[PDB]
């Protein structure tokens, strides 16, 4: 009498629009505890918003130029941001203040993430390097000469033992965190604009600037699934796994829509309309069927969408 729900499609609908940034939004992320959404922007600001109701909570300031990415610690108490001012900053969310400024990159910092233990941060920069930083001291532990063009994404796996990086040089590389040495290079060679590890730890989801998302088994070098129909030839647009309800892949797009695909069949199951510029970033809530999306400078808003499945 116990049955398994299996949705053909979700029904995400617009619930709230979050206004307040004054330039393009660059990233949105839900806190691990589900309570908050953080956004970053070219306007040099981080904003915090209620994850369930969209209500503005606070602004966090101090970078001297625009910000490309922001990421939460596992306990939801810290943020790290990556800026054009060549630094990362670690923030105490409660106080709103900067704890540490991570100095060492020689050009814009584009991407960042804590490891799950949250004692480390990983960054990637226009300077073509990946850096690994100690949270407690705020100092650089390792500099990896990772790529030969800007680094577009960095992500740790679930125990922090591996980092995956992507670059406009066309490569995805897997690094051993403890030693900094490369375990594998995945290779046409179109620019890779986003990558992250999959929920089961075995795959990487990679976006390339040829309008294509691919799910790769990184150990076998085999592409398992491919998702198309969206537009992505210019911007580094995040992609997500939606793990709370039906199994979906989510991404923004240069045609101003959020795209959602069936993980297994690869068919588009919904397109979310409402933004008025490129949707550069999307995020999926960790426990509820909620999506956040954010757009470039003609729009400058974040939208929260909710589904029943
Ligand atoms: C547990 O893993 C999840 C869970 C949710 C999602 Br959305 C993706 C993954 S996965 O990408 O890591 N594994 C996977 C891949 C395919 Cl192609 C088919 C079925 C799968 O469970």
Chain center to CA of 217 = 20
List of residues 6+ apart from 227 with CB closer than 8 A = 212, 213, 214, 215, 249, 251, 259, 261, 266
The DSSP output letter for 190 is P
Q: Tell me the structure's resolution in angstroms, rounded to a single decimal.
A: 1.2
Structure tokens at 86: 């060549």
Provide Rg for the chain, Cα atoms.
18
CATH number for the domain that contains residue 48? 2.130.10.10
Longest dimension (CA), the chain: 61
* CA-based nearest residue to 127, from 71, 87, 185: 87
Cα-to-centroid distance, 203 and ligand 1 (Å): 9
List residues near ligand 1 (CB under 6 A): 198-200, 203, 215, 224-225, 241-243, 247-248, 263-264
Alpha-carbon gap, residue 151 to 146, rounded angstroms: 8
* CA-based nearest residue to 54, from 39, 64, 69: 39
List strand residue ranges (DSSP E) for 126-274, in order: 130-134, 140-144, 151-156, 162-167, 172-176, 182-186, 192-197, 203-208, 212-217, 222-227, 239-242, 248-251, 258-262, 268-272
Q: How many CB atoms lie within 10 A of CB 145?
A: 11
Contact 174, 206 (CB under 8 A): no
Structure tokens at 283: 């995020």
Burial of 136 per CB tally in 10 Å (0-12, 13-18, 19+): exposed
Cα-to-centroid distance, 281 and ligand 1 (Å): 21
DSSP bridge pairs for 193: none
Alpha-carbon gap, residue 137 to 141, rounded angstroms: 10
**Ligand 1 atom closest to Cα of residue 200:** 12
Cα-to-centroid distance, 215 and ligand 1 (Å): 10
* CA-based nearest residue to 253, from 225, 274, 281: 281
| Side-chain-facing half-sphere of 119: CA atoms under 13 Å | 7
**Ligand 1 atom closest to Cα of residue 205:** 11
**Ligand 1 atom closest to Cα of residue 241:** 7
Burial of 212 per CB tally in 10 Å (0-12, 13-18, 19+): middle
What is the torsional sign of CA 201, 207, 208, 210? positive
Cα–Cα distances in Å, from 215 out to 96, 150, 249? 37, 22, 10
Cα-to-centroid distance, 221 and ligand 1 (Å): 17
Cα-to-centroid distance, 199 and ligand 1 (Å): 6
Edge-to-edge, what's the strand order for the sheet holding 279-284? 13-18, 302-306, 290-295, 279-284
**Ligand 1 atom closest to Cα of residue 201:** 12
Q: How many CB atoms lie within 10 A of CB 188?
A: 7
Q: How many CB atoms lie within 10 A of CB 95?
A: 10
240: alpha, beta or left? (left if phi > 0; alpha if psi -120 to 50): beta
Cα-to-centroid distance, 200 and ligand 1 (Å): 6
Cα-to-centroid distance, 309 and ligand 1 (Å): 17
Alpha-carbon gap, residue 90 to 112, rounded angstroms: 11
Alpha-carbon gap, residue 231 to 155, rounded angstroms: 23
Alpha-carbon gap, residue 16 to 28, rounded angstroms: 14
Alpha-carbon gap, residue 153 to 123, rounded angstroms: 8
Alpha-carbon gap, residue 171 to 190, rounded angstroms: 8
Task: Please choose from 240, 241, 247 the residue to mutate so as to test ligand 1's pocket, defined by most ligand atoms within 8 A of CB.
Answer: 247
Cα–Cα distances in Å, from 271 out to 12, 138, 164, 224, 256? 9, 41, 28, 23, 10
Specify the number of domains making up the chain: 1
Per the listing, tokens 């910000």 go with: 67
DSSP bridge pairs for 208: 192, 212
Residue range of the domain that includes 200: 1-309
List of residues 6+ apart from 3 with CB closer than 8 A = none
């Amino acid at each position: 009498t116990q049955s398994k729900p299996t949705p053909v499609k979700p029904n995400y609908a617009l619930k709230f629009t979050l206004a307040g940034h004054t330039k393009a939004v660059s990233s949105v992320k839900f806190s691990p505890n589900g309570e908050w959404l953080a956004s970053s922007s070219a306007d040099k600001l981080i904003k915090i918003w209620g994850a369930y109701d969209g209500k503005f909570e606070k602004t966090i300031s101090g970078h001297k130029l625009g910000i490309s990415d922001v990421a939460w610690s596992s306990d939801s108490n810290l943020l790290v941001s990556a800026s054009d001012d060549k630094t990362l900053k670690i923030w105490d969310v409660s106080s709103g203040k900067c704890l540490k400024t991570l100095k060492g990159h020689s050009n814009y910092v584009f991407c960042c993430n804590f490891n799950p233990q949250s004692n480390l941060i990983v960054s990637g920069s226009f300077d073509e390097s990946v850096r690994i930083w100690d949270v407690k001291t705020g100092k650089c532990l390792k500099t990896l000469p990772a790529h030969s063009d800007p680094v577009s994404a960095v992500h740790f796996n679930r125990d922090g033992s591996l980092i995956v990086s992507s670059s406009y040089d066309g490569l995805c590389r897997i690094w051993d965190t403890a030693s900094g040495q490369c375990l594998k290079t995945l290779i046409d060679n179109p620019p890779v604009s986003f990558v992250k590890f999959s929920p089961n730890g075995k795959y990487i989801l990679a976006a390339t600037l040829d309008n294509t998302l691919k799910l790769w088994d990184y150990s076998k070098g085999k592409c398992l699934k491919t998702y198309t129909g969206h537009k992505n030839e210019k911007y580094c647009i995040f992609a997500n796994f939606s793990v709370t309800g039906g199994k979906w892949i989510v991404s923004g797009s240069e045609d101003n829509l959020v795209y959602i695909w069936n993980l297994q069949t690869k068919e588009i199951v919904q397109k979310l309309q409402g933004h008025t510029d490129v949707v550069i970033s999307t995020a999926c809530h960790p426990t509820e069927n909620i999506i956040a999306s954010a757009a470039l400078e003609n729009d400058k808003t974040i939208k929260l969408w909710k589904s029943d499945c």
